Design an enzyme around this catalytic site. Structure first.
Site, mmCIF file in Angstrom:
data_model
loop_
_atom_site.group_PDB
_atom_site.id
_atom_site.type_symbol
_atom_site.label_atom_id
_atom_site.label_comp_id
_atom_site.label_asym_id
_atom_site.label_seq_id
_atom_site.Cartn_x
_atom_site.Cartn_y
_atom_site.Cartn_z
ATOM 1 N N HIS A 1 0.830 -1.190 0.000
ATOM 2 C CA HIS A 1 0.000 0.000 0.000
ATOM 3 C C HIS A 1 0.870 1.247 0.000
ATOM 4 C CE1 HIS A 1 -0.510 1.206 4.566
ATOM 5 N NE2 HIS A 1 0.759 1.058 4.235
ATOM 6 N N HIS B 1 -1.607 -10.864 -0.871
ATOM 7 C CA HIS B 1 -0.792 -10.719 -2.076
ATOM 8 C C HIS B 1 -1.444 -9.780 -3.087
ATOM 9 C CE1 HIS B 1 1.519 -14.028 -0.345
ATOM 10 N NE2 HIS B 1 2.483 -13.683 -1.181
ATOM 11 N N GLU C 1 -0.640 -3.148 11.234
ATOM 12 C CA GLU C 1 0.309 -2.983 10.130
ATOM 13 C C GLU C 1 1.603 -3.731 10.403
ATOM 14 O OE1 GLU C 1 -0.026 1.277 7.798
ATOM 15 O OE2 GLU C 1 1.080 1.217 9.683
ATOM 16 N N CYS D 1 5.694 6.784 4.540
ATOM 17 C CA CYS D 1 4.390 6.139 4.401
ATOM 18 C C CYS D 1 3.729 6.462 3.056
ATOM 19 C CB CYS D 1 3.491 6.588 5.550
ATOM 20 S SG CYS D 1 4.443 7.020 7.023
HETATM 21 N N1 LIG Z 1 11.864 -19.718 -2.334
HETATM 22 C C1 LIG Z 1 11.025 -18.680 -2.345
HETATM 23 N N2 LIG Z 1 9.725 -18.897 -2.519
HETATM 24 C C2 LIG Z 1 8.984 -17.772 -2.433
HETATM 25 C C3 LIG Z 1 9.441 -16.485 -2.180
HETATM 26 C C4 LIG Z 1 10.835 -16.266 -2.012
HETATM 27 O O1 LIG Z 1 11.403 -15.195 -1.808
HETATM 28 N N3 LIG Z 1 11.561 -17.438 -2.117
HETATM 29 N N4 LIG Z 1 8.580 -15.441 -2.071
HETATM 30 C C5 LIG Z 1 7.218 -15.827 -1.720
HETATM 31 C C6 LIG Z 1 6.276 -14.635 -1.782
HETATM 32 O O2 LIG Z 1 6.860 -13.528 -2.063
HETATM 33 O O3 LIG Z 1 5.091 -14.740 -1.573
HETATM 34 C C7 LIG Z 1 6.746 -16.873 -2.722
HETATM 35 N N5 LIG Z 1 7.677 -17.994 -2.678
HETATM 36 N N1 LIG Z 2 -2.479 6.176 12.331
HETATM 37 C C1 LIG Z 2 -1.728 5.668 11.354
HETATM 38 N N2 LIG Z 2 -0.528 6.195 11.107
HETATM 39 C C2 LIG Z 2 0.153 5.537 10.139
HETATM 40 C C3 LIG Z 2 -0.293 4.433 9.406
HETATM 41 C C4 LIG Z 2 -1.578 3.909 9.660
HETATM 42 O O1 LIG Z 2 -2.123 2.974 9.083
HETATM 43 N N3 LIG Z 2 -2.233 4.590 10.672
HETATM 44 N N4 LIG Z 2 0.500 3.864 8.477
HETATM 45 C C5 LIG Z 2 1.945 3.979 8.635
HETATM 46 C C6 LIG Z 2 2.676 3.518 7.379
HETATM 47 O O2 LIG Z 2 1.924 3.053 6.386
HETATM 48 O O3 LIG Z 2 3.890 3.596 7.325
HETATM 49 C C7 LIG Z 2 2.277 5.444 8.906
HETATM 50 N N5 LIG Z 2 1.389 6.023 9.910
HETATM 51 ZN ZN LIG Z 3 6.401 -11.709 -1.582
HETATM 52 ZN ZN LIG Z 4 2.384 1.322 5.527
#
Ligand SMILES: Nc1nc2c(c(=O)[nH]1)N[C@@H](C(=O)O)CN2
Ligand SMILES: Nc1nc2c(c(=O)[nH]1)N[C@@H](C(=O)O)CN2
Ligand SMILES: [Zn+2]
Ligand SMILES: [Zn+2]
Ligand SMILES: Nc1nc2c(c(=O)[nH]1)N[C@@H](C(=O)O)CN2
Ligand SMILES: Nc1nc2c(c(=O)[nH]1)N[C@@H](C(=O)O)CN2
Ligand SMILES: Nc1nc2c(c(=O)[nH]1)N[C@@H](C(=O)O)CN2
Ligand SMILES: Nc1nc2c(c(=O)[nH]1)N[C@@H](C(=O)O)CN2
Ligand SMILES: [Zn+2]
Ligand SMILES: [Zn+2]
Ligand SMILES: [Zn+2]
Ligand SMILES: [Zn+2]
Lengths: 120, 118, 118, 120, 115, 114
Positions: free
Chosen positions: D15, D70, D109, D26
C-alpha cells in the site's frame, strides 16, 4: 571454539516476483514485513568484552536499511527479481565491505518462511 | 546428527563498565535475558532421546538461580556482563555437569544475541 | 476507533516494599513493553486519528527517561511496580496526548498491567 | 456473563498513503505483513459448546481475505487511502453482513502498531 | 480502572464430542490461558496482588490441566475453548475473587475471552 | 557466492505420550523444514516455499489433529524420534532436505540431520 553475534531488523516493503507463471500470487504487487538477521563471527575483545557493539552493526546497516524500508524493492538495482534468496545475497554484498566479520544474512518475508545466505 | 535445545528466561540488571561516557549501555539497566542450551549426542535406542529435557532444567537450575532477579556485575566473572561474556560464563558453569553441551545462546532482547560454542 | 503503539525499553528496578527475602526486592531488571492506546475521531481526509509516528514522538521524551535506566531514580517511581509505572506513564503522556485512553505495561512476556482512569 | 471469540489472520500486501505530507516514507509505495483479528460476541450453544466453529469464521472471511492477500490495497474500491483505521472499518463493512455477531476488527500494520474498530 | 493479567501455558489432549466425522479425533494443543484481575492498587505495596500469588492460586488448577486429557475432568466433557474459559473461571474465581476474565487460546491464532 | 539455505515452519495440533510425562496429553507441535541447494538464476530461488508446503502436506495431515502414538514408527513419540521420523517421510519427496527441527513447546526442541 567460536563466538557468533546476531542482530535482527525489520523493514516494511513492497515487491513482486517477475519470473513466476501468470497465475502465481507472488507475481502480483504485494509486500511484507521483511525481517533480516545479520550474523557476525569474530573474536571477543578482552577490553570491550564484545565482538562489535550491536549499535555499530545497526549503524553499519543503516544506509542499506533505509534503501529497503518503506520502498518498492523492484526499483532498486540488483533487486529486479527480489526473492528472499536474491535479497539475502544483495544485503550481503552491500554490508560485507563495511562489516567484514559478517558470516550470514537471513531474510524472512513472513515469520514462518526464510532464507539464509552465508557468502563465505 | 541429533541436537537438542531448551530455552530459559531470567530477569536481571547489568551495566557495561568499559563503554565511553555517553553510551546508554553503561548506565544501570536490565533485560529479560533468554538463554538456549544446546546438546549434541547419540539418541538412546530405548528412551528415544539423548537426554530428558527435565535434566537440562535441573542441571541449569543452580546457575539460573544465581542469574535470575540479580545484578550481574556482582557475580564473579561477570564484571563486564556483555552477552558474549555471559554466554561463555554460562558454558563454563554448565559444561562440567552437561558434557554433551554444544552451544550456549544468550539474547538480551528478542532482536539481538550471541552464540558461544566452546 | 482505537489506535495503539507498542514500545520496549530495557531497565532495572527493585521493589522496596516487598517482604524481606523475596527475589523482587533484589536489584534486577526486565525488558518492559508499553502500549499506548488512544481513542478518537478519524479525520475524513487524513484517514487516521494521529500518525503512529506522532504518538511515538510524543512518547519519546518519557521513553528516553525509562530506557536503559534504573527506574527507582526517577521521581514518582520509587516503588516501581507495573501498576505504579502504568499510572506514571499515563500521567506523563496524557498531557501531550489528550486522546490517550489506556496504558499497558508488560514486565515479562507473560505478566502485565493495564491502566485507564482512577 | 458474556463470551467473546476471536480468530487471527495474516496477509501480505502493498500500500501507500496518498494524502500524507510530501516526503513521508508512508507516502512511498511499500508494504506489510498485516494482521487482522476478527472479534465476535454472543451466546455459547449448550450442545456444540461454542458460539461458532473457528473454521467457519475462517471460511466466512476467506473472500475478503483473498482480496487483501498478495495484493496492492490502493486498487481496491474504498481502500484508496489504505490506513489501518480505514482498513479496519473497511473489513468491518465487508464482514459484518456475513458475520452479524462481529463486535470488533483489529488490524496491525506491524508487530507493534495497529487499530481496533468497534462500529463508531 | 486498573487491571492485572498473567499468562500460563499447559500441554494437554482433548476431542470434541458434538461434531460429525471430521477435530472430532483425539488431539491436543499448547493451551495459553490468561487470568485477568481488576482491583484497587494498595498504597504501600504498589500492586493489586503479587503475580507470584496468582501463579500459586492457579497452580492446583494448572496441575489438573497440564499433561492431562481434558474430557475426563468433570465439567469439561465438551472441552471447547468457550467451555474451558468458563470452567477455569469456576475453579479460580473462589481462589481469586478479583478475577475479571479468563482467555483461553488453543493455538497462537485462535481463542476465547470469558467475563 | 557460497551456500544458500531455505526453511519453512508448520504447526500441527496433536496428542501424544511417552511409554518410558507418560500421561495422555498433547502439544502445538512446530516443525521447521530446512533445505540447502543452488538458487536458479531464472527463478531467483532454490524452490518455491509453496512447493515445500505441498510436498510436506501429506505427512502434515497424518500428524495434525491426530494421536501420534497410533502412527506406524511413532510408538515412542519423542521429539527426537518425531524429527527423525519426519525426515524419513519427507526426504524422498524433498531431496534437498538438510535439517528437520521439531519444537514440542515454544521453549524446547530437537534438530535432526540425516
Ligand atoms: N523460495 C522462495 N519462494 C517464495 C518467495 C521467495 O522469496 N523465495 N517469495 C514468496 C512470496 O513472495 O510470496 C513466494 N515464494
Ligand atoms: N495512524 C496511522 N498512522 C500511520 C499508518 C496507519 O495505518 N495509521 N501507516 C503507517 C505507514 O503506512 O507507514 C504510517 N502512519
Ligand atoms: Zn512476496
Ligand atoms: Zn504502511
Ligand atoms: N555485542 C554487544 N553489544 C552490546 C551488548 C552486548 O551484550 N553485546 N549489550 C547491549 C546492551 O547491554 O544494551 C549493548 N551492546
Ligand atoms: N502485581 C505485581 N506483581 C509483581 C510485580 C509488579 O509490578 N506487579 N513485579 C514483579 C517483579 O518486579 O519481578 C513481581 N510481582
Ligand atoms: N469456537 C471454537 N471453535 C473450535 C474450537 C473451540 O474450542 N472453539 N475447537 C477447535 C479444535 O479444538 O480443533 C475447533 N473449533
Ligand atoms: N528429550 C525429551 N524429553 C522430553 C520430551 C521429548 O520429546 N524429548 N517430551 C516431553 C513431554 O512430552 O512432556 C518430556 N521430556
Ligand atoms: Zn544491557
Ligand atoms: Zn521486577
Ligand atoms: Zn482442539
Ligand atoms: Zn508431551
Amino acid at each position: 571454539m567460536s563466538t557468533t553475534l546476531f542482530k535482527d531488523f525489520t523493514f516494511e516493503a513492497a515487491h513482486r516476483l517477475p519470473h513466476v507463471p501468470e497465475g502465481h500470487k507472488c507475481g502480483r504487487l504485494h509486500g511484507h514485513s521483511f525481517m533480516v538477521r545479520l550474523e557476525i563471527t569474530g573474536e571477543v575483545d578482552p577490553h570491550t568484552g564484545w565482538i562489535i557493539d550491536f549499535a555499530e552493526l545497526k549503524a553499519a546497516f543503516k544506509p542499506t536499511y533505509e534503501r529497503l524500508d518503506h520502498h518498492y524493492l523492484n526499483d532498486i538495482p540488483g533487486l529486479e527479481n527480489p526473492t528472499s534468496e536474491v535479497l539475502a545475497k544483495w544485503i550481503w554484498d552491500q554490508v560485507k565491505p563495511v562489516v567484514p566479520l559478517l558470516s550470514a544474512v537471513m531474510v524472512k518475508e513472513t515469520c514462518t518462511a526464510g532464507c539464509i545466505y552465508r557468502g563465505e
